């Protein structure tokens, strides 16, 4: 499969999440995603085919993971925006007030701005600390998907937020949305990964 940020993958034939970013660890191909998406060794599939397994994850506390893929996968330095793509150029962290967009299999590509950093989400499983908050909307299934600036600086991966009863926070004004992402920098250093760029 062609690995692009934002596309759907399933975990153990049950849960759905979105790919965050193509990465490599030495000769190993992988993608970073959210820790809540799977436990170590869970099976990820794209379009019904097995593409790899969860190599490591941390959740709750943090919310990160990487999936090691088979050598047949093609890694691409891109994030889906509808039928178009955003090229990944690096991982400089943007500041509060910057515009950012996120991509995921449920709500597609949505943009907003960064409103706060170092936010704690008290999920039922336990708290997740240090997340960055944005006001782009998102829904069930977007977890793990890419957060990136239009200039291509990858910011992190979708964790969670204040989903409403219709399964997203897109039906409430941007001022009332809390859409949280795990910063990418610490995931790259924690697992020794290099982002694929173009």
């Amino acid at each position: 499969a062609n690995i692009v940020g934002g596309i759907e993958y399933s975990i153990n034939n049950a849960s759905l999440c979105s790919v965050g970013f193509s990465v490599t660890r030495g000769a190993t191909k992988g993608f970073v995603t959210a820790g809540h998406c799977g436990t170590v060794n869970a099976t990820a599939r794209i379009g019904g085919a097995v593409v790899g397994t969860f190599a490591a994850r941390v959740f709750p506390g943090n919310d990160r993971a990487w999936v090691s893929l088979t050598s047949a996968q093609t890694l691409l330095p891109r994030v889906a925006n509808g039928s178009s793509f955003v090229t990944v150029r690096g991982s400089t962290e943007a500041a509060v007030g910057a515009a950012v967009c996120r991509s995921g299999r449920t709500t597609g590509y949505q943009c907003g701005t960064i409103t706060a950093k170092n936010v704690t989400a008290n999920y039922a499983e336990g708290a997740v600390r240090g997340l960055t908050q944005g006001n782009a909307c998102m829904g069930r299934g977007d977890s793990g998907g890419s957060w990136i600036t239009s200039a291509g600086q990858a910011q992190g991966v979708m964790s969670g937020g204040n989903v409403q009863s219709n399964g997203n926070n897109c039906g409430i004004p941007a001022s009332q949305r809390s859409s949280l992402f795990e910063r990418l920098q610490p995931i790259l250093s924690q697992y020794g990964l290099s982002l694929v760029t173009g």
Binding site: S15, L16, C17, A34, H36, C37, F59, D63, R105, T106, A121, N122, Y123, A124, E125, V128, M138, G139, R140, G141, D142, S143, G144, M158, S159, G160, G161, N162, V163, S178, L180
Partner: peptide
């Protein structure tokens, strides 16, 4: 808040 996932 809930994580997400689907």
């Amino acid at each position: 808040a809930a994580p997400x996932x689907a």
